[PDB]
PDB file of N, CA and C and ligand atoms in Angstrom:
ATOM      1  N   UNK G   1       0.807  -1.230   0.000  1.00  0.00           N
ATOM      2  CA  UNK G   1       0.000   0.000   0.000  1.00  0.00           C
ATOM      3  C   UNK G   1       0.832   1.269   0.000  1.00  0.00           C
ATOM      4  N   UNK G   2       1.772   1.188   0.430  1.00  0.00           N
ATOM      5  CA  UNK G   2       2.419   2.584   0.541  1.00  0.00           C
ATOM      6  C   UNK G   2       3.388   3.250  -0.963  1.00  0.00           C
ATOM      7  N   UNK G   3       3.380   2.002  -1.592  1.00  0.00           N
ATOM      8  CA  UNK G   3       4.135   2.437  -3.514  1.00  0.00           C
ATOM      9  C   UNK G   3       3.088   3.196  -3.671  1.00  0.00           C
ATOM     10  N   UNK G   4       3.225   4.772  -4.008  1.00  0.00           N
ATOM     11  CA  UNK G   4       2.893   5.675  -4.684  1.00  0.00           C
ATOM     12  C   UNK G   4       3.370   6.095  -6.137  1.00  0.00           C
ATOM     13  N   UNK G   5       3.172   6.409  -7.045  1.00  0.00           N
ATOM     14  CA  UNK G   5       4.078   7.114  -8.213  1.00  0.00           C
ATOM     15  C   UNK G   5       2.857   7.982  -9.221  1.00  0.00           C
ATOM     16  N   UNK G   6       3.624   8.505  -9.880  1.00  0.00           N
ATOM     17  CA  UNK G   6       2.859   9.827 -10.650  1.00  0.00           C
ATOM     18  C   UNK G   6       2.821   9.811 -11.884  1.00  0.00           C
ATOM     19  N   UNK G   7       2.195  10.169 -12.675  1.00  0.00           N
ATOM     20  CA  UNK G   7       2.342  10.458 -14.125  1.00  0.00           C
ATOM     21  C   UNK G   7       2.701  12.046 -14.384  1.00  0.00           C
ATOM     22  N   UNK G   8       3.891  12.630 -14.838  1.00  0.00           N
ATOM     23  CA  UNK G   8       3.677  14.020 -14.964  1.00  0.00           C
ATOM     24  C   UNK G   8       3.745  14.522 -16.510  1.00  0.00           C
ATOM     25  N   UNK G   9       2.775  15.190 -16.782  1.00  0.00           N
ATOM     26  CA  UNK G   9       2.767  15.335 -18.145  1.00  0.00           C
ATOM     27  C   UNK G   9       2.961  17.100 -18.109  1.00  0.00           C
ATOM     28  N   UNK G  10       4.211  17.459 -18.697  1.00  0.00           N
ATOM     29  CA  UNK G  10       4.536  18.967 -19.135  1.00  0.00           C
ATOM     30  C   UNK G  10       4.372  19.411 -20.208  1.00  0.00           C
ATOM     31  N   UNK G  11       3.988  20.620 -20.304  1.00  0.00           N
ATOM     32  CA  UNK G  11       3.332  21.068 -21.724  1.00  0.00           C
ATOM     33  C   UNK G  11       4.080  21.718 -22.234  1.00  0.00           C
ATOM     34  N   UNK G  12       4.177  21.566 -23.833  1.00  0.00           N
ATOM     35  CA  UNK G  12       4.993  21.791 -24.734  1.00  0.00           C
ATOM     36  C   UNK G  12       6.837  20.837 -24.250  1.00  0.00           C
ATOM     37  N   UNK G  13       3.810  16.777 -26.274  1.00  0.00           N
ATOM     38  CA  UNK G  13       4.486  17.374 -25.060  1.00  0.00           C
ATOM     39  C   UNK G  13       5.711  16.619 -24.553  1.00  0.00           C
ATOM     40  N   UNK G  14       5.659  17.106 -23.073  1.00  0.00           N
ATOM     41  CA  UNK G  14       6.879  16.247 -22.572  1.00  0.00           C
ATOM     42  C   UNK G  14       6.212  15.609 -21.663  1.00  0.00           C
ATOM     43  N   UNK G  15       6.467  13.914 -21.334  1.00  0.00           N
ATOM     44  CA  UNK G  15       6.015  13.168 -20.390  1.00  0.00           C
ATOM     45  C   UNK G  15       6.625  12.250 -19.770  1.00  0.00           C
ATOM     46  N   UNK G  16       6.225  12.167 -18.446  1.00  0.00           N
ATOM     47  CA  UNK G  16       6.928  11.499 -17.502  1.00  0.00           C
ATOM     48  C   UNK G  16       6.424  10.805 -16.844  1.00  0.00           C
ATOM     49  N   UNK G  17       6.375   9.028 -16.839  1.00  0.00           N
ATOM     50  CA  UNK G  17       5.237   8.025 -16.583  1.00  0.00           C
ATOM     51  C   UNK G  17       5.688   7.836 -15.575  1.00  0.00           C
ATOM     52  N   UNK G  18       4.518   7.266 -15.063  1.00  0.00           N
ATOM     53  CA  UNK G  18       4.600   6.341 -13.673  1.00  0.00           C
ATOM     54  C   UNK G  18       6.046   5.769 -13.485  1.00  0.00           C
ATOM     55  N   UNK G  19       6.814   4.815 -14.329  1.00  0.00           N
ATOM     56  CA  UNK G  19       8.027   4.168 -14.056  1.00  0.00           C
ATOM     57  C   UNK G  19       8.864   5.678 -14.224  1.00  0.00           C
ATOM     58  N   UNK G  20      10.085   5.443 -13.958  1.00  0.00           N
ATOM     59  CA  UNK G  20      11.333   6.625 -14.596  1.00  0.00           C
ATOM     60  C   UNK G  20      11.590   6.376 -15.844  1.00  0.00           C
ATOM     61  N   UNK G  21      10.659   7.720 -16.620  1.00  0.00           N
ATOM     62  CA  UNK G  21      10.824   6.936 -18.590  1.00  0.00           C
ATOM     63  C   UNK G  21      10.255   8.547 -19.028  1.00  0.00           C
ATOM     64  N   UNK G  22      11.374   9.019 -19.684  1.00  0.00           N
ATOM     65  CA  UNK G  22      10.672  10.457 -20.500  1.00  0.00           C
ATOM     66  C   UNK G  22      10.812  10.327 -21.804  1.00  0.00           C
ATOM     67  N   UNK G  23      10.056  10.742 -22.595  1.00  0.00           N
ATOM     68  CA  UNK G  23      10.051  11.203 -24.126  1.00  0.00           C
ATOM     69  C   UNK G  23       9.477  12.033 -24.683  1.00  0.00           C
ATOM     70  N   UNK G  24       9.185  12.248 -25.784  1.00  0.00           N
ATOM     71  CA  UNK G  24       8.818  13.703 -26.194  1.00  0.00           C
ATOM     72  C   UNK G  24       7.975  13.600 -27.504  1.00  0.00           C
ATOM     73  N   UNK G  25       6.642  12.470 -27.400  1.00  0.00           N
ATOM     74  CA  UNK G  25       5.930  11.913 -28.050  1.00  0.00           C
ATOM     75  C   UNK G  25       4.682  12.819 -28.728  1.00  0.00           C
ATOM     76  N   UNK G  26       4.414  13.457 -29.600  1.00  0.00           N
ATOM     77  CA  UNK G  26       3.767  14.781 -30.087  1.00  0.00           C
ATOM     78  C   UNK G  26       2.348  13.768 -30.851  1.00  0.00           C
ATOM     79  N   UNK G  27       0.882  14.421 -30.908  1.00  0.00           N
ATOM     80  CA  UNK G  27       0.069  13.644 -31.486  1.00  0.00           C
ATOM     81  C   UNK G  27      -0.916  15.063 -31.830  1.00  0.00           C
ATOM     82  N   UNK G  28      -1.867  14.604 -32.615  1.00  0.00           N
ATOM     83  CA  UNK G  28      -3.082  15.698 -32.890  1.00  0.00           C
ATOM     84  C   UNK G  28      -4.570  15.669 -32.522  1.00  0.00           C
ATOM     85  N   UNK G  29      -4.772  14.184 -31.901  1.00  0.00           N
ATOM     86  CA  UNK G  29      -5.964  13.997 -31.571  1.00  0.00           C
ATOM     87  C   UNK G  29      -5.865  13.623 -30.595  1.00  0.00           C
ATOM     88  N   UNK G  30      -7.159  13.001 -29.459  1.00  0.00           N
ATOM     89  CA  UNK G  30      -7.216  12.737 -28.094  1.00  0.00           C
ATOM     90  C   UNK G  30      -6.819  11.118 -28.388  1.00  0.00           C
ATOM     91  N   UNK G  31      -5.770  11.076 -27.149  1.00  0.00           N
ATOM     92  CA  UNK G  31      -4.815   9.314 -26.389  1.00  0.00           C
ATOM     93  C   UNK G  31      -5.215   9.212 -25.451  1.00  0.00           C
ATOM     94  N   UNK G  32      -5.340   7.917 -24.956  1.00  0.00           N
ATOM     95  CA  UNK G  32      -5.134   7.171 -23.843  1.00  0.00           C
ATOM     96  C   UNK G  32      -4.308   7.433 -22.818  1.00  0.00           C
ATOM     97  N   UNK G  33      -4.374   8.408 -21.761  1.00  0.00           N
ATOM     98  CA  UNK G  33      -3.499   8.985 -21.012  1.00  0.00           C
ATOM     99  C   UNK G  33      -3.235   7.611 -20.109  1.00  0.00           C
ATOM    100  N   UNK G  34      -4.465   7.157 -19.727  1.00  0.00           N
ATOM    101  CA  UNK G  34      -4.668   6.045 -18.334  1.00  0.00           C
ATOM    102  C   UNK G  34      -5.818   5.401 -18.671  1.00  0.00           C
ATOM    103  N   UNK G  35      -5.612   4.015 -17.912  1.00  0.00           N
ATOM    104  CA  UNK G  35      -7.294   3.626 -18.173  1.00  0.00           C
ATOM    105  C   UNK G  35      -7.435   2.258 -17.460  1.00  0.00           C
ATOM    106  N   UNK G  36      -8.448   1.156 -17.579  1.00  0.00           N
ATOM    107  CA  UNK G  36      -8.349  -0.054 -17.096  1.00  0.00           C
ATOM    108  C   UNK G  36      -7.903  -0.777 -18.012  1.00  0.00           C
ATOM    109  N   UNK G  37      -7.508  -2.049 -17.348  1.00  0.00           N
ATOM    110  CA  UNK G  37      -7.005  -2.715 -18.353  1.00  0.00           C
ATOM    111  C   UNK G  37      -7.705  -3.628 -19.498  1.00  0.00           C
ATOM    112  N   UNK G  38      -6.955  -2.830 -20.313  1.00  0.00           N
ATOM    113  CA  UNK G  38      -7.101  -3.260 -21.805  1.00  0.00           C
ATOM    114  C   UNK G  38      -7.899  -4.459 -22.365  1.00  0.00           C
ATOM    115  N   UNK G  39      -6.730  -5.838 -22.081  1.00  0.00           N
ATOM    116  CA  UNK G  39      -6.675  -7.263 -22.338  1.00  0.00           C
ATOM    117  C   UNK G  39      -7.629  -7.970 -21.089  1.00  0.00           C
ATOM    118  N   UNK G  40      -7.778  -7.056 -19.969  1.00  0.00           N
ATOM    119  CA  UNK G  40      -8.855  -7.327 -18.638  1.00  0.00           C
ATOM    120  C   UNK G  40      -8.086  -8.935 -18.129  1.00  0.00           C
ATOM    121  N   UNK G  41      -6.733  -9.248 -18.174  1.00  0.00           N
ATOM    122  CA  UNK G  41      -6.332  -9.927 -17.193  1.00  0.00           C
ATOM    123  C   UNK G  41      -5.511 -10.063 -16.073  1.00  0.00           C
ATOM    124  N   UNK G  42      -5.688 -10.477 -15.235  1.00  0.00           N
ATOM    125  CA  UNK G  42      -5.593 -10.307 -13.671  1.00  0.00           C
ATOM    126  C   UNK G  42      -5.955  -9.249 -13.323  1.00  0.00           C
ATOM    127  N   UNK G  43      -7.449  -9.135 -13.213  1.00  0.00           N
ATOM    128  CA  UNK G  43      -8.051  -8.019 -12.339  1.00  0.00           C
ATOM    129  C   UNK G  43      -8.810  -8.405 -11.491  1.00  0.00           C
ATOM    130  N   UNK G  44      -8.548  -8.171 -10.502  1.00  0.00           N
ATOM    131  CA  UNK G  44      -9.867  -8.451  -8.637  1.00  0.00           C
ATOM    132  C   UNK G  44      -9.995  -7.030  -8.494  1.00  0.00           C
ATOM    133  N   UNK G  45     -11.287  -7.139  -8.357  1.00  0.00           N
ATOM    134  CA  UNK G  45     -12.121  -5.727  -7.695  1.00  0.00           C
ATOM    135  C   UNK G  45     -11.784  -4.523  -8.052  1.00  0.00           C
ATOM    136  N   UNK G  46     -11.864  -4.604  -9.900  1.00  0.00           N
ATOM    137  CA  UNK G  46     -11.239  -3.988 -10.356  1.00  0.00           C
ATOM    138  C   UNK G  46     -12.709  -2.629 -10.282  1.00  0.00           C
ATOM    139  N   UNK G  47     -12.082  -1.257 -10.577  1.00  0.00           N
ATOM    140  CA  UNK G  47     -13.244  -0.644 -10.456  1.00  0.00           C
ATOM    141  C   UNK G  47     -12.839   0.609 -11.696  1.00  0.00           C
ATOM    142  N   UNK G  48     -13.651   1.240 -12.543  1.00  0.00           N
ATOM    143  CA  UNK G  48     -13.862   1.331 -13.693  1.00  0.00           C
ATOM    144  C   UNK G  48     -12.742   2.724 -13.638  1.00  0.00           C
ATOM    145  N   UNK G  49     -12.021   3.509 -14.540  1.00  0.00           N
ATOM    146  CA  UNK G  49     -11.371   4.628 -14.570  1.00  0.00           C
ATOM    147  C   UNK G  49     -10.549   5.120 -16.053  1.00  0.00           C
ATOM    148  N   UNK G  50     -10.484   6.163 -16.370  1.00  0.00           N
ATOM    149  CA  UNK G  50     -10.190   6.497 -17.537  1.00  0.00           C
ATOM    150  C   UNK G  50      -9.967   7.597 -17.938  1.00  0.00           C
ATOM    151  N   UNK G  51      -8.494   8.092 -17.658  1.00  0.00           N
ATOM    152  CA  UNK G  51      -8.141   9.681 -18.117  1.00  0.00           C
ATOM    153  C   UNK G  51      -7.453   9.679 -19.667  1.00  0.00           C
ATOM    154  N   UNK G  52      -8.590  10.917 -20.647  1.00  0.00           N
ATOM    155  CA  UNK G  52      -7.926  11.086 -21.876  1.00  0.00           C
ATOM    156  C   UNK G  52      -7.522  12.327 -21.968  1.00  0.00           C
ATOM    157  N   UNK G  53      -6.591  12.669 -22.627  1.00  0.00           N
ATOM    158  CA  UNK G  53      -6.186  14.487 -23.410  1.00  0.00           C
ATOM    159  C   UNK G  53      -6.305  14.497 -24.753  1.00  0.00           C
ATOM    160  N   UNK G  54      -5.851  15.397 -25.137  1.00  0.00           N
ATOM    161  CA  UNK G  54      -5.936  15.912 -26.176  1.00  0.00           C
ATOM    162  C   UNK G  54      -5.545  17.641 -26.727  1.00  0.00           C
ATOM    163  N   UNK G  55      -4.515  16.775 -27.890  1.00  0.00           N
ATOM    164  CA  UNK G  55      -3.592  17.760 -28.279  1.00  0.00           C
ATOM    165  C   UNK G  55      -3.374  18.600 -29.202  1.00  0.00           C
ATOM    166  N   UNK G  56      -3.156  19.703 -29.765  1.00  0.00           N
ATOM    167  CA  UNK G  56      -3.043  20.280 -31.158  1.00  0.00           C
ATOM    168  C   UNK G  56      -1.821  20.812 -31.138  1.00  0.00           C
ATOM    169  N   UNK G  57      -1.349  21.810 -32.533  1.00  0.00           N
ATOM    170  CA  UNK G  57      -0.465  22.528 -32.804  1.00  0.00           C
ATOM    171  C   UNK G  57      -0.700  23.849 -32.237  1.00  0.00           C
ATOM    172  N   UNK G  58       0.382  24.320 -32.225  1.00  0.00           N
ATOM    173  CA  UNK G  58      -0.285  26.166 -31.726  1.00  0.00           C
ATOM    174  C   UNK G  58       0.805  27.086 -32.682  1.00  0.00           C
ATOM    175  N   UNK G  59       0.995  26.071 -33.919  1.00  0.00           N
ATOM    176  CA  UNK G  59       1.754  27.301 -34.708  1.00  0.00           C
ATOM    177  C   UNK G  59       2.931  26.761 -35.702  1.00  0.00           C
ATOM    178  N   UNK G  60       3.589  25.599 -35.567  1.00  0.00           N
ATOM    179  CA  UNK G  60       4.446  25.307 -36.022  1.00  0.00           C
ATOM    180  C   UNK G  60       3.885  23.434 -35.913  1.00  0.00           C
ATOM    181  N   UNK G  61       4.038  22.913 -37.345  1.00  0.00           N
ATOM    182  CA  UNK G  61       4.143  21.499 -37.128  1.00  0.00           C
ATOM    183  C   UNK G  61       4.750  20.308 -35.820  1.00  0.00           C
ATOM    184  N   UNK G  62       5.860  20.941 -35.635  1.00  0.00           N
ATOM    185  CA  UNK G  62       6.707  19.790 -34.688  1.00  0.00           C
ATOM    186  C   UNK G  62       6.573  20.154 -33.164  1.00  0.00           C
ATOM    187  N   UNK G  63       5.697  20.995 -32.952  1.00  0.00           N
ATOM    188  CA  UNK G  63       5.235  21.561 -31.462  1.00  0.00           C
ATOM    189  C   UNK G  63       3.586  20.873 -31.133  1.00  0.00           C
ATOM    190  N   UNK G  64       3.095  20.608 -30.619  1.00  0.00           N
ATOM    191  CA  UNK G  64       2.347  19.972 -29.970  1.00  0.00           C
ATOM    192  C   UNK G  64       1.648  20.518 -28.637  1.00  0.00           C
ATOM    193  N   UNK G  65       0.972  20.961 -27.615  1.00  0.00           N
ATOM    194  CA  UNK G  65       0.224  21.405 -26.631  1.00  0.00           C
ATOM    195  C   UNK G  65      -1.137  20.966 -25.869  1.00  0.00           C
ATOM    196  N   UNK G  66      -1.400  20.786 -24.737  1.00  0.00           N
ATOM    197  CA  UNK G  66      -2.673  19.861 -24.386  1.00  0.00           C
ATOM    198  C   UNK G  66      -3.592  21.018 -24.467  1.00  0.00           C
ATOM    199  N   UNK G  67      -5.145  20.609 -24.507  1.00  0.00           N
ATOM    200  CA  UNK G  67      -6.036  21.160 -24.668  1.00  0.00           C
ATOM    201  C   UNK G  67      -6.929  21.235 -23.583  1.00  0.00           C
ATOM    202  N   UNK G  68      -7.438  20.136 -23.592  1.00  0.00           N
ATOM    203  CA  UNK G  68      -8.412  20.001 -22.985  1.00  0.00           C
ATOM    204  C   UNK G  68      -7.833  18.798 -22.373  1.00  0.00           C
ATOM    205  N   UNK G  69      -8.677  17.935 -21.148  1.00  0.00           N
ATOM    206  CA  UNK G  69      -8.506  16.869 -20.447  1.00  0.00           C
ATOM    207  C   UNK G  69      -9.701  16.043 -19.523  1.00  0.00           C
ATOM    208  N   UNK G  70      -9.821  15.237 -20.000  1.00  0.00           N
ATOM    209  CA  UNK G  70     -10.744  14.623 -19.450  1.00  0.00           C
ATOM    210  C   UNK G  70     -11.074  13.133 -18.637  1.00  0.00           C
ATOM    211  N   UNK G  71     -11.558  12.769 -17.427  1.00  0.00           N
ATOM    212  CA  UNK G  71     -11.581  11.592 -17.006  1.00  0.00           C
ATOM    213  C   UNK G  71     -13.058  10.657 -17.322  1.00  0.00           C
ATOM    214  N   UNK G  72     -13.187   9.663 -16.816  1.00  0.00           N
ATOM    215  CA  UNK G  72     -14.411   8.964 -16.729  1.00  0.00           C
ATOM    216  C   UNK G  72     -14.360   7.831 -15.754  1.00  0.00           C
ATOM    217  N   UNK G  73     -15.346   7.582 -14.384  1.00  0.00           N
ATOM    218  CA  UNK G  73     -15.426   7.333 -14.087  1.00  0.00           C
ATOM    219  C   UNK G  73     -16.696   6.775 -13.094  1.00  0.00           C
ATOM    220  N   UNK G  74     -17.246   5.655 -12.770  1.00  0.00           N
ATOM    221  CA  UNK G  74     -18.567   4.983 -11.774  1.00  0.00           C
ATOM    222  C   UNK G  74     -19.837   5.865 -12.844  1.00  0.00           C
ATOM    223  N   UNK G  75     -19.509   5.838 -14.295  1.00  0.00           N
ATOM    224  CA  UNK G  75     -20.714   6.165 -14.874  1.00  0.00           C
ATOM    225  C   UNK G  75     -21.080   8.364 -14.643  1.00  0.00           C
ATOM    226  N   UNK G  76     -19.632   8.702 -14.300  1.00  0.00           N
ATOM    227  CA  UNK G  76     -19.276  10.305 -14.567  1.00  0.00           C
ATOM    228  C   UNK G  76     -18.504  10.782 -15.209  1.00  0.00           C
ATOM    229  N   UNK G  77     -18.743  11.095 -16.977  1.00  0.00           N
ATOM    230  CA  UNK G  77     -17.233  11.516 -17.145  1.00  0.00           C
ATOM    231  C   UNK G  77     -16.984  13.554 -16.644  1.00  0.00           C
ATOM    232  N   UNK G  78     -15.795  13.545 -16.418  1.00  0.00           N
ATOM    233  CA  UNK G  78     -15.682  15.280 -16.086  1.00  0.00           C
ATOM    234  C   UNK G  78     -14.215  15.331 -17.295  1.00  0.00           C
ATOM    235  N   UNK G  79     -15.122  16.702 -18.245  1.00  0.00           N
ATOM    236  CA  UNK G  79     -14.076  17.325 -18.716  1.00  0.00           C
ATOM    237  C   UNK G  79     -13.634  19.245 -18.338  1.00  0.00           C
ATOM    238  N   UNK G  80     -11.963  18.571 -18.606  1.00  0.00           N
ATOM    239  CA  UNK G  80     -11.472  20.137 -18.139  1.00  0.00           C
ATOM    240  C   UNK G  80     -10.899  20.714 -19.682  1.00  0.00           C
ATOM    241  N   UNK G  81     -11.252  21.778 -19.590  1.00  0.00           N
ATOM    242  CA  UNK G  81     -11.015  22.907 -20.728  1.00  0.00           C
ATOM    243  C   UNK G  81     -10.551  24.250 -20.167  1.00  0.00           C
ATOM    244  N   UNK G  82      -9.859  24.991 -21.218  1.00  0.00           N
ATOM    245  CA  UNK G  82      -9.093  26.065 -20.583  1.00  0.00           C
ATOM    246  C   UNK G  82      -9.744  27.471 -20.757  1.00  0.00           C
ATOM    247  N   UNK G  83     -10.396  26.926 -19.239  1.00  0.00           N
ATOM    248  CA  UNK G  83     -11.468  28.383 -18.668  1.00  0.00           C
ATOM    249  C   UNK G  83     -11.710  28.203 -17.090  1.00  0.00           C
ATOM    250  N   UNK G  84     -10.716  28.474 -16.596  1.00  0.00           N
ATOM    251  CA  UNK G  84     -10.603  28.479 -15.366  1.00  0.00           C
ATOM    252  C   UNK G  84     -11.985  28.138 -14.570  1.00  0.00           C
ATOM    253  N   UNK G  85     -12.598  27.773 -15.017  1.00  0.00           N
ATOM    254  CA  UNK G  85     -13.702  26.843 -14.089  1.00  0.00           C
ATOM    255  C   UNK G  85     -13.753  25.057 -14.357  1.00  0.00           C
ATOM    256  N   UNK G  86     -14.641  25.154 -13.954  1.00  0.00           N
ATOM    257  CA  UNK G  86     -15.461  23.394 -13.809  1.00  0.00           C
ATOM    258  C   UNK G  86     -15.380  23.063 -15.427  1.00  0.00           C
ATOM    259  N   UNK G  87     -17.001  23.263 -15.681  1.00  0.00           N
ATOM    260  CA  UNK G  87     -16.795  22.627 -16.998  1.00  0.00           C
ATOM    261  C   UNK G  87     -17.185  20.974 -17.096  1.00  0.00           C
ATOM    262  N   UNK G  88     -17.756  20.311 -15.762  1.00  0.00           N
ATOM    263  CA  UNK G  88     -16.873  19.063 -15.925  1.00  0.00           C
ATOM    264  C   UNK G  88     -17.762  18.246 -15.552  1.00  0.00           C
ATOM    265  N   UNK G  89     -19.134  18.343 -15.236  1.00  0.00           N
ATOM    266  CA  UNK G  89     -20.858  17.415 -14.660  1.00  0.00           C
ATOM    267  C   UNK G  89     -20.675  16.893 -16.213  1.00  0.00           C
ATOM    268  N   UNK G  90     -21.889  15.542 -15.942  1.00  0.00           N
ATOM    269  CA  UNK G  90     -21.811  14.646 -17.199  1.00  0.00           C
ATOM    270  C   UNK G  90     -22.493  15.509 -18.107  1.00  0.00           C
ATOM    271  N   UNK G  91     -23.519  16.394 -18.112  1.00  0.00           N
ATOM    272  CA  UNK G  91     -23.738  17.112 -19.350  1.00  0.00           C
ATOM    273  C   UNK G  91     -23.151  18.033 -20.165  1.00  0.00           C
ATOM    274  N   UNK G  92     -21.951  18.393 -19.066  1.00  0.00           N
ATOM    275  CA  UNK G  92     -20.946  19.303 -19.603  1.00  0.00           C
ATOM    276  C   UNK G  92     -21.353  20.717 -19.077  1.00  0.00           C
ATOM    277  N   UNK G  93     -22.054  20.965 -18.337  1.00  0.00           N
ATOM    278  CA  UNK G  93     -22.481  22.731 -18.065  1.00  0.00           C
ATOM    279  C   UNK G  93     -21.408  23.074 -17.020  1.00  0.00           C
ATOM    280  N   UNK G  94     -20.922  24.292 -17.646  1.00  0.00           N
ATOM    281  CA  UNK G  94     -19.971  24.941 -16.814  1.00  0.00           C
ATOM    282  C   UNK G  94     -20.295  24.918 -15.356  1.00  0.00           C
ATOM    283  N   UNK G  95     -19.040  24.949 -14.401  1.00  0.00           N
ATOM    284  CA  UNK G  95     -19.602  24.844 -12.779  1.00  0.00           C
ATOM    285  C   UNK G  95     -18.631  25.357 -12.312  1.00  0.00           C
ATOM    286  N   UNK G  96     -18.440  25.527 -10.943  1.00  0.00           N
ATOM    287  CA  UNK G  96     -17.392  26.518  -9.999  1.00  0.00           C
ATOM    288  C   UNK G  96     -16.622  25.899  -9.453  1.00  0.00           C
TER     289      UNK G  96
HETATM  290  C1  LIG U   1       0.485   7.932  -2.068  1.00  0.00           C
HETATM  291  O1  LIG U   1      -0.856   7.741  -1.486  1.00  0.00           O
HETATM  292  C2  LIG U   1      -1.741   8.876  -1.488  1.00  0.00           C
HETATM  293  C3  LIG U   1      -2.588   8.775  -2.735  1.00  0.00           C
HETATM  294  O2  LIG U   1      -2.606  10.002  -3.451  1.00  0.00           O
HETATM  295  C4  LIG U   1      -0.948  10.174  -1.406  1.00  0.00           C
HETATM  296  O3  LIG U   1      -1.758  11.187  -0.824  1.00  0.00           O
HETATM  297  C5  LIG U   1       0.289   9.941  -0.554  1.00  0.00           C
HETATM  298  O4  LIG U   1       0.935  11.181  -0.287  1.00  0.00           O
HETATM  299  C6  LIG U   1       1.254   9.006  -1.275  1.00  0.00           C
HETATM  300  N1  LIG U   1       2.170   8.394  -0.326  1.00  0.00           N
HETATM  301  C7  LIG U   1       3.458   8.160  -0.598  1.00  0.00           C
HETATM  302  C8  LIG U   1       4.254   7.520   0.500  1.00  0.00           C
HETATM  303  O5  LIG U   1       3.958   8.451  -1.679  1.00  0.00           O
END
């Protein structure tokens, strides 16, 4: 119980997974940030989860930037967009 670790994702992207592993992997549409597993083997009490992003250009081909970000989860997905609020109930109406 006490192994913790992080995913850190820096913009303009650059990413840094859970293990110690960086690269500098550029895309144009929304990836698979996190999620359950895939192939669904060896899972006990597994319980449902799923963070995606999504990326564009902001000017130059070989540059890349996140957009928006979004999870899903127990039948809620919340998305974040860049407007300093919420944004993020399953119908999508802005919130505080
Ligand atoms: C990992 O467990 C919780 C989950 O976020 C976190 O708050 C805590 O600070 C972390 N503990 C360690 C030892 O990394």
């Amino acid at each position: 119980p006490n192994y913790n670790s992080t995913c850190w994702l820096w913009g303009d992207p650059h990413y840094n997974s859970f293990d110690g592993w960086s690269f500098d992997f550029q895309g144009t549409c929304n990836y698979l940030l996190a999620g359950t597993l895939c192939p669904g083997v060896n899972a006990e009490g597994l319980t449902p989860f799923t963070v995606t992003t999504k990326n564009e250009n902001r000017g130059s081909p070989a540059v890349s930037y996140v957009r928006q970000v979004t999870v899903t989860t127990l039948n809620t997905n919340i998305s974040i967009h860049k407007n300093e609020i919420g944004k993020v109930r399953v119908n999508g109406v802005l919130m505080a």
